[PDB]
Amino acid sequence: SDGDQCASSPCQNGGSCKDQLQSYICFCLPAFEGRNCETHKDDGSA
């Protein structure tokens, strides 16, 4: 009962949305980045 910021799935790139205290959190893979998982980390050779 601390606000629901996971109704329209704010996460992206198949990110997992989880309702947390105050705000929320997007659980994604280690190869992804960004607040809403919208930055595919494709480097490999970098």
Ligand SMILES: *[C@@H]1O[C@@H](C)[C@@H](O)[C@@H](O)[C@@H]1O
């Ligand atoms: C939610 O967590 C993320 C990290 C991925 O494993 C998703 O497939 C899962 O549903």
